[PDB]
Amino acid sequence: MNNLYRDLAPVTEAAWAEIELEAARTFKRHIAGRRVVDVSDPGGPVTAAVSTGRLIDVKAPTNGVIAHLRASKPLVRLRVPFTLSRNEIDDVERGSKDSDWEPVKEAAKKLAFVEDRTIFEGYSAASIEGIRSASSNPALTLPEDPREIPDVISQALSELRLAGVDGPYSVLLSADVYTKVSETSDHGYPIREHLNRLVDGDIIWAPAIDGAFVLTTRGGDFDLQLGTDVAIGYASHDTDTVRLYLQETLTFLCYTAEASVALSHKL
Amino acid sequence: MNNLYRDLAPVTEAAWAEIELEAARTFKRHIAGRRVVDVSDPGGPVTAAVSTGRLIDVKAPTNGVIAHLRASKPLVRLRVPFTLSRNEIDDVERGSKDSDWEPVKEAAKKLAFVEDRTIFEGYSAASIEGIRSASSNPALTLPEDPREIPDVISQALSELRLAGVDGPYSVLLSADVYTKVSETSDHGYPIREHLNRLVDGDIIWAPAIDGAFVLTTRGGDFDLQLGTDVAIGYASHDTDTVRLYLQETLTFLCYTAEASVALSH
Amino acid sequence: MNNLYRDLAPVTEAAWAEIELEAARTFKRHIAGRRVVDVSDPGGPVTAAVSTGRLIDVKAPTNGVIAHLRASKPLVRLRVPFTLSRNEIDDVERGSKDSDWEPVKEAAKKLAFVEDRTIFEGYSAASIEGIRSASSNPALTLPEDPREIPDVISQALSELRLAGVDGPYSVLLSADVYTKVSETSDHGYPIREHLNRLVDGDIIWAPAIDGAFVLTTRGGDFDLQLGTDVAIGYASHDTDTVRLYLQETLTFLCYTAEASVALSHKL
Amino acid sequence: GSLSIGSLK
Amino acid sequence: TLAAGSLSIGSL
Ligand code: NI
Ligand code: NI
Ligand code: NI
Ligand code: NI
Ligand code: NI
Ligand code: NI
């Protein structure tokens, strides 16, 4: 087996299929960074750091020697446990299609939110600076009148163009801002139709973030280094419940500061 | 080597690749004239002038001889130096993707802006008049109300059609006017959709120019004669920095005065 | 070219051959750890860390997430500069075999000593614990009478055997202890002959260390992870001198504490 | 599916 | 000579 120890879990093959399908589509619904950043191939469970190529001054061993430490970006392991009812698991083989996978969906929503928040807002505990913090472009404020959103997106796009940044530009909207853009109509004309003619890329539903982001999808600017992609592992079980978990080992790196424009509300 | 002396620069092959990629795409993002003018093939480093075909009266050598000088537009060499940190250069081979190429991008933005302003606004020191100065069509004023921009574009287009000018018409907007067209909506209707339905060509982002231009892309009217296209050369270096440069040798010629309409504030 | 920029150095092809030969054989004479530890394949200039496989507890991003950082041992870049006379370099092509390569030999001796000291004594600035510090076996004192050296070596060997450690056992002696073992004779019988019958491996000349070490060469206990092996690079030059350097990027890891026995003089 | 897969666009 | 330059010491 592997570190997941999936073979030791009292879960039917049929139940495994339902659990894996639900976790997969639920994670994809809440996730949005994996649609604009460069996601690498899984490097394996041995992957523990990403070389940043930079040198770090360190005390020399003796005189006449110049010593430097090799800088690297560490990987963080995210593990979201959840508990399932063994009755719901055993019901799958008996023909049940309404088994309670809500703990599975909540773990997928949580892991997806942690990942997108790590990419865009940051994760200081893992030395991961967010895109918003690294954005060298002037941040903008979302207007109070939603009919003025095309104005702020247009200025954000011009900031990217004035910084020498190319590539198909995409706009990531938070759950509240996305709903606002979908419903707002300036004199009946829907403002999302206005935005669709301004964005050569896509307008992405990003529920984990807050505010909005305007970035490029040319590639080579945002790097999601995967060591271990999302997987379902087994922890423990009794005669009534099974403790599983969603696990992922990754880190994020932002190579181009001017490749993004952050947007936020006002307090 | 050549006059660039690239082989003498302490820059790794890996660093050269990223430096060239960054300079290339940054120059292409800020450039906007090569999308409406005719850019020729590079004539080589020997290219020094472009024949204008015209004759110039000059003093005869003796009686009975009619002497004329062959008029020609000279080429100008633009050279934008920049300095890179050797730590950032050496970091590339060690696996760094965040090396500081801002001096490369700033040199690209400067060289691109010099070229576009030379094409559209002129460069008198190089005998380059420019599209705006040579445009025989009546210049227009951009309106204060951005919702009236379709009015001024429609009149600019009508000026070209009334001058016998054909071809796909294109509109080049400055950074401020382009952002205004993208955001302005007349009663919710985006004015860019109105403009896109009036322009059979493209609406080009032209950050280096000021105002706007409406011209034809039929060909044969605006000629950007390249002797040497944009390249990266090596100047000098120490133990900490390398001084490189973006170089280009070109000239611009405007053959048709009525082929363009200039707009300003 | 690469980060060494060797092509920019005013050094003849003939001089490069002699300079590289001298550095190679000089480094090989003073080095003594690369003969008992596991030296890995060069991972390349991109290599910056070695996964230790362990997790480090870190603050969770939100509730319900268990976050751990992947541990990694960093690589250190050692660079020993030296200066050569351009007259000595240009003499090589003219047929000189007495060119002054002493700066090369001193840089090789310095880099070799730094490496063995890092392997056996440690390098705290680079988070590299020495073999002596990590040795869980009881350390021993070299006797005052050199004719009693076989006694302390025999007890060191028994310490390894009593710890379940197998493999060909080797003994690394410092410059002073090695010379004493070579010259000392107990009633005319050379004590080195006694030691050669006690060691199934080799008795290694280790001038960089002090004291002595008795360890196993079975493999998998001492790991010298090479990112870039020792190479000669170019820094700067004028009309009279050239500044070159020996560069190396590596780390050391000790996986088995009981696989070695350290010995020192009586303080 | 299988847990999840990157490169969703 | 005038290239890479790894003396290729390795395991001795
Ligand atoms: Ni709003
Ligand atoms: Ni349990
Ligand atoms: Ni005449
Ligand atoms: Ni002339
Ligand atoms: Ni924790
Ligand atoms: Ni000879």
Residue numbers in the entry:
A (entry chain H), C (entry chain I): 1 to 267
B (entry chain L): 1 to 265
D (entry chain h): 323 to 331
E (entry chain i): 319 to 330
Question: Which of the paper's sentences describe this entry?
Answer:
Dye-decolorizing peroxidase (DyP), an enzyme involved in Mtb’s oxidative stress response, is encapsulated in a nanocompartment, encapsulin (Enc), and is important for Mtb’s survival in macrophages. Enc nanocompartments self-assemble to form a protein shell with icosahedral symmetry. The Enc protein is a homolog of a single subunit viral capsid protein and adopts a HK97 (bacteriophage Hong Kong 97)-like fold. DyP is a heme-containing enzyme that oxidizes and degrades a wide range of synthetic dyes and, importantly, reduces hydrogen peroxide (H2O2) to water. It has been shown that Mtb-DyP is a hexamer, where the C-terminus of Mtb-DyP contains the TP sequence that targets Mtb-DyP to the interior of the Mtb-Enc 60-mer shell.
The crystal structure of the Mtb-Enc•DyP complex was solved by MR to 3.15 Å resolution and refined to a final Rwork/Rfree of 20.2/23.3. Application of crystallographic symmetry generated an intact 60-subunit capsule with T1 icosahedral symmetry. While the compact domain of Mtb-DyP (residues 1-314 based on the AlphaFold Mtb-DyP predicted structure) lacks a corresponding electron density in the interior of the Mtb-Enc shell and cannot be modeled, the electron density for Mtb-DyP-TP was observed. In the ASU, nine DyP-TPs were modeled. These peptides were bound to the interior of subunits D, G, H, I, P, Q, R, S, and T, and are referred to as d, g, h, i, p, q, r, s, and t, respectively. In addition to the Mtb-DyP-TPs, the Mtb-Enc•DyP structure displayed excess electron density that we modeled with molecules from the purification and crystallization process: glycerol, nickel (Ni2+) ions, and PEG molecules. Notably, the crystal structure of Mtb-Enc•DyP described here has the smallest mycobacterial five-fold pore described to date at 3.6 A. In the crystal structure, the Cα of His187 is translated ~5–6 Å upwards, resulting in the orientation of its carbonyl oxygen directly into the pore, and Tyr189 is angled ~45–50° along the pore and translated such that the hydroxyl group is ~6–7 Å away from its cryo-EM position. Further, when investigating areas where small molecules from the purification buffer or crystallographic condition colocalize, we noted intriguing small pores formed at the interface of neighboring subunits along the five-fold symmetry axis, which will be referred to as five-fold minor pores, while the pore formed at the five-fold symmetry axis will be referred to as the five-fold major pore. The resulting pore has, on average, a bottleneck diameter of 3.4 ± 0.8 Å, with −1.8 ± 0.4 hydropathy and 26.6 ± 4.1 polarity.
